[PDB]
Every structure is written in structure tokens, then in C-alpha cells.
Amino acid sequence: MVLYFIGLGLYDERDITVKGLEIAKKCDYVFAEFYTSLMAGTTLGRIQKLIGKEIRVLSREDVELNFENIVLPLAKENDVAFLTPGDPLVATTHAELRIRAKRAGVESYVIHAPSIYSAVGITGLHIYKFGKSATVAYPEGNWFPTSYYDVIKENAERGLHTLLFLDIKAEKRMYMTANEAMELLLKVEDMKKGGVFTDDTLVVVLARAGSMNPTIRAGYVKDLIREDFGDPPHILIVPGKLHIVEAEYLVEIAGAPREILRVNV
Amino acid sequence: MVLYFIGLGLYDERDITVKGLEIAKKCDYVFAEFYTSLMAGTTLGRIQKLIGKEIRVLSREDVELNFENIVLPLAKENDVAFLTPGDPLVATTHAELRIRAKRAGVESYVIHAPSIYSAVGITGLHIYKFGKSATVAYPEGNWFPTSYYDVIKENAERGLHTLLFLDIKAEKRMYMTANEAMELLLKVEDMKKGGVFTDDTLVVVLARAGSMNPTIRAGYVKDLIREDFGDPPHILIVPGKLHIVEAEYLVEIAGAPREILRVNV
Numbered sequence: 388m389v390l391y392f393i394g395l396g397l398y399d400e401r402d403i404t405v406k407g408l409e410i411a412k413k414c415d416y417v418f419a420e421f422y423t424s425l426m427a428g429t430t431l432g433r434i435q436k437l438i439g440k441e442i443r444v445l446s447r448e449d450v451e452l453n454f455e456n457i458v459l460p461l462a463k464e465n466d467v468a469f470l471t472p473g474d475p476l477v478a479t480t481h482a483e484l485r486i487r488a489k490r491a492g493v494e495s496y497v498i499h500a501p502s503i504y505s506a507v508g509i510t511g512l513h514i515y516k517f518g519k520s521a522t523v524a525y526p527e528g529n530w531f532p533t534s535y536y537d538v539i540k541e542n543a544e545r546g547l548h549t550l551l552f553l554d555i556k557a558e559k560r561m562y563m564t565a566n567e568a569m570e571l572l573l574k575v576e577d578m579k580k581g582g583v584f585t586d587d588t589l590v591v592v593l594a595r596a597g598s599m600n601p602t603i604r605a606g607y608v609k610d611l612i613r614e615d616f617g618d619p620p621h622i623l624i625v626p627g628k629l630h631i632v633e634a635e636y637l638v639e640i641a642g643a644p645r646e647i648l649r650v651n652v
Numbered sequence: 653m654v655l656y657f658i659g660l661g662l663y664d665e666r667d668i669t670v671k672g673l674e675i676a677k678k679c680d681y682v683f684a685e686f687y688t689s690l691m692a693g694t695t696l697g698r699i700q701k702l703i704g705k706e707i708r709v710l711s712r713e714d715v716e717l718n719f720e721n722i723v724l725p726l727a728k729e730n731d732v733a734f735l736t737p738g739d740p741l742v743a744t745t746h747a748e749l750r751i752r753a754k755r756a757g758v759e760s761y762v763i764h765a766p767s768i769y770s771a772v773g774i775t776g777l778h779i780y781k782f783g784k785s786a787t788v789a790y791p792e793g794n795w796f797p798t799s800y801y802d803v804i805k806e807n808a809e810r811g812l813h814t815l816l817f818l819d820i821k822a823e824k825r826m827y828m829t830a831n832e833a834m835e836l837l838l839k840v841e842d843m844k845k846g847g848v849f850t851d852d853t854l855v856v857v858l859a860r861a862g863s864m865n866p867t868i869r870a871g872y873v874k875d876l877i878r879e880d881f882g883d884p885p886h887i888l889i890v891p892g893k894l895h896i897v898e899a900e901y902l903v904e905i906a907g908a909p910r911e912i913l914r915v916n917v
């Protein structure tokens with residue numbers, strides 16, 4: 388009679404909380420999805436071994452179209468868990484799944500876990516200063532989307548930071564690197580020419596947040612565009628004007644050039 | 653000879669990640685602060701019991717003025733952990749403490765935990781639609797803070813949601829309720845009269861996120877300003893322009909007036 392939305396956290400199988408683990412262990416059925424994101428620091432096998440339960444993976448369609456025919460029926464006479472990378476309900480369409488549960492007479496509870504939305508605090512950038520967030524999508528065919536560029540513009544204009552999620556093809560396991568995101572943004576700049584993203588723009592790259600050894604690099608596009616940040620997933624941030632304390636952290640921790648202490652403050 | 657920043661999570665001791673628990677267990681010394689937030693469902697004893705160590709609790713002054721004199725010296729010869737509610741680097745100034753660590757030749761690692769910043773996802777409001785954040789601070793003497801009012805205005809003009817962290821005076825055991833935040837906001841409106849926060853403004857209250865039954869309520873200020881949302885901590889959110897599914901969730905899950913379903917696109 389109960390459905391548990393449980394977050395898996397950032398990087399590996401140990402990123403789930405103690406509460407999430409113990410609750411999952413007591414569930415009769417455990418489902419998971421890896422289409423909104425993947426756990427690059429672990430495998431399904433390692434997660435299953437840790438939880439001690441067989442885990443049935445669900446595709447995007449399984450969830451978006453048939454959540455009520457696959458997960459909810461079991462939740463009527465059993466304790467069921469639905470695992471997702473990060474913190475539950477962060478992915479835009481997941482909150483609606485709770486309405487589906489209610490509609491079916493099923494109780495649902497949320498067990499939180501670390502999300503990149505909060506984990507980016509490791510970049511030293513004040514989290515109250517982040518503005519609207521966006522996702523950089525690959526152009527294709529006659530389709531060349533650029534809304535994420537306008538997001539950066541509206542945020543930076545008000546001195547706010549822009550968190551940028553990079554395109555991902557979970558099924559094909561293809562990730563968009565920060566390098567690719569930068570090249571794309573430079574391309575969008577040439578078309579819109581709004582003075583939003585150029586070789587002189589300061590950016591921050593966060594990779595493998597949650598791991599014990601994340602990659603945190605900050606610098607100008609002209610110097611980072613071809614730099615190797617390691618294996619995905621990569622997160623890109625376009626800071627607004629910096630707090631001197633933010634800049635100092637970026638210099639001392641993320642290896643940013645001293646130049647930002649005078650140029651971007 | 654290392655220093656761990658380890659988040660404890662939202663509500664109780666079980667909100668710590670498995671990674672944080674296992675690392676915290678093997679540390680030689682364990683320090684912690686409980687003034688940046690409130691973990692309503694646990695006690696120091698329960699935390700110590702879970703980690704199996706003696707925890708030395710530090711005050712804001714101990715940290716902000718003497719972190720390098722109390723914590724760092726021990727990190728040079730041992731493995732030290734510094735625990736904090738939620739995520740250690742979110743809406744705190746703890747990030748700067750990593751600079752101090754580095755300058756003392758001490759390596760530091762950050763272990764994230766669920767934060768209120770991402771937990772807002774449980775309100776049904778799209779996480780990427782949040783704009784600049786702010787803190788409703790208690791007036792002191794003749795000093796009446798009001799900047800947070802302007803943040804709401806700026807975000808609202810952009811159709812973005814506003815997350816409002818609520819004040820806390822831990823040494824006086826004072827935790828601002830959403831009710832007090834609303835009262836203070838109406839007073840600021842009377843002063844500025846920008847039509848930003850009135851009896852008719854739709855707001856959302858999230859109380860004790862991290863618990864199994866958090867209080868999630870949405871509605872007009874006039875109706876919620878005196879409602880009892882239970883014990884602290886609370887956060888207040890003034891949504892911007894709503895998507896239909898967001899309104900649907902607020903109505904079905906947060907008990908908002910059915911009339912907000914009719915969004916004025």
C-alpha cells in the first residue's frame with residue numbers, strides 16, 4: 388500500500404542515504420530508472436548488491452506512459468520503491484507521478500538524496516546567486532534550439548549564476564562534454580551576437596560531483612575549451628559577477644587564473 | 653591527516669549518505685555545528701550513537717573565528733570530520749573554510765547530503781524554474797532588512813519561483829516560521845507598495861522536509877498567514893508563473909485552492 392520515491396545520490400552506490408537504504412531493503416519490489424541520468428561511479432550490479440534486492444529497470448516510456456500499470460498495481464498490496472539518480476522529484480516530470488499514485492489510492496513518501504542542484508555548491512559559488520537553470524541540447528536536422536543561451540543572458544544581466552545541464556543519451560550512453568557545450572555556445576553567440584558567451588567569458592566546470600575526487604575547474608573559455616575534464620558527467624556553469632570570496636575560492640580550489648580577482652569581481 | 657566536510661541531511665541522523673556514515677565512522681576526531689540549520693527529528697546523542705564517536709559541537713564564533721585553531725591543527729596528524737545539517741556548502745559560508753584548510757596545508761573532501769535547496773522539488777514546482785534565492789531575516793533594533801522583497805519582485809517579473817530561506821537564531825533557539833515570514837513581508841509591502849506581496853499572493857510552505865510526513869501547503873497569504881504548519885524548520889516559496897502540471901500538483905498534493913488550476917497564461 389506504499390510507494391517510496393528514493394534518491395540514489397550523485398556518483399556511486401554509497402550516495403544513497405542511510406534512510407533510503409534501510410527503506411529500500413524492506414520493500415517487496417524495487418524499480419529504478421536511469422534515463423534522466425546515470426550513476427557513472429557505479430553499476431546496476433553494485434547497487435543491487437548493496438540494497439540486497441533485485442532491481443527492475445524501467446525505461447522512459449515505462450515511467451511516463453505506464454507508471455500506473457507497472458509500479459502502482461504492486462504498491463496496492465506491497466511496499467514498493469522507485470529509485471532515481473540524485474534527489475527524487477528533481478526531474479521535471481517526476482512530481483506528477485505522485486498525483487498518479489494518489490489517484491490510484493496509493494500512499495507515497497519521498498526519501499531525499501544529494502542533487503547536483505545543491506552539490507554545485509562545491510564550486511564555491513553562492514547558491515542564492517543561481518538563477519533560472521537550463522539544459523544545453525544538441526542541434527539536429529533543421530532544429531537549432533538556443534533558449535539556454537537566453538537563460539544565461541537574463542541571469543548574468545542580473546548578476547546571477549547559470550547552472551547548465553548537458554545533453555545526454557542515456558540509452559546510447561552518449562554524454563555531451565563541457566568542451567562540446569562551450570563550442571556550441573560559441574556557435575550560438577556568432578548567430579545571436581548578444582555578447583553573452585565568448586572566448587573571454589569565465590566558466591566553471593564540475594565533473595563527477597559526489598565522487599571522492601571531483602574535477603572542479605574555473606577559467607576563461609579560450610583556455611578551457613580544449614582542456615580535458617575527464618569522464619562524464621560534466622556540468623557547466625556561467626557565473627555572474629563574482630563575490631570576492633567566490634573568486635578566491637575559484638582561484639584557490641578550482642585553479643582559476645588570478646586575473647578573475649580583478650576582472651570578474 | 654585529512655579533513656572531511658560531511659553533510660548530515662534534512663531531518664534526522666539517517667539523512668546522512670552511506671558514504672558519509674562509513675567515512676565519519678573511521679575518523680579520529682569529529683566536530684560539528686548546528687547553527688546553520690535545524691534537524692528537527694534527531695538529537696546529538698542519536699548522531700553520536702550512529703557514528704559511534706564523541707562529537708564536539710562548535711558555535712558560530714568557534715567556526716568563523718577559530719576554525720583554524722580548533723579543527724585544522726588536528727587535521728594535520730589525524731583524519732577529522734566536520735558535520736553540518738543538510739549539505740555543508742549550501743546557504744552557509746563554510747566553503748571559505750576550505751581555503752583556510754588549504755592555506756594550513758590540510759587536504760579537504762566534501763561529502764554531500766540532501767539539501768533543502770533541492771528538496772523543494774517535493775512542492776511540485778519545477779526546480780529549474782527557481783530564480784535568485786533570498787533569506788527573510790528577523791529585524792533587530794531599528795534595522796529592518798528588506799532586500800529579500802526585491803528578489804521576489806525580480807524573479808516574479810521573470811515568471812521565476814523564489815525560494816526563501818528563513819532566519820535562525822540557534823543560540824536563542826529561535827526558528828522563523830513561514831507565518832512570521834509572511835507577516836514581515838506584508839509589512840515591507842506596506843512600505844514599498846510594489847504589489848509584490850499581498851493577501852492575494854499565492855505562496856507555498858514546506859516544513860520539516862526530510863521527515864516522512866513533511867507539511868506541504870500552498871495557497872493565498874490571507875488564508876495561510878495564520879495556519880499552523882507544525883514545528884520548524886520552514887521555508888517559504890513565492891511561485892512565479894505556473895505550469896499547468898505545477899498547479900495540478902499544488903492542488904492535489906498541497907491542498908491549494910482548485911482555482912489556481914486556471915492559470916492566466
Ligand SMILES: Nc1ncnc2c1ncn2[C@@H]1O[C@H](CSCC[C@H](N)C(=O)O)[C@@H](O)[C@H]1O
Pocket residue numbers: 505662663688689690737738739740741742743744766767768769816817818819820858859860861862885886887
Ligand atoms: N528540512 C527542512 N525543512 C524546511 N526548511 C529547511 C529545512 N532544512 C533547512 N531549511 C531551511 O533553510 C534554513 C537553513 S539554511 C542552511 C541550509 C543547509 N546547508 C541545507 O543544505 O539545507 C532554515 O532556516 C530553513 O528555512
Ligand code: NA
Pocket residue numbers: 517518520779780782783
Ligand atoms: Na536553482
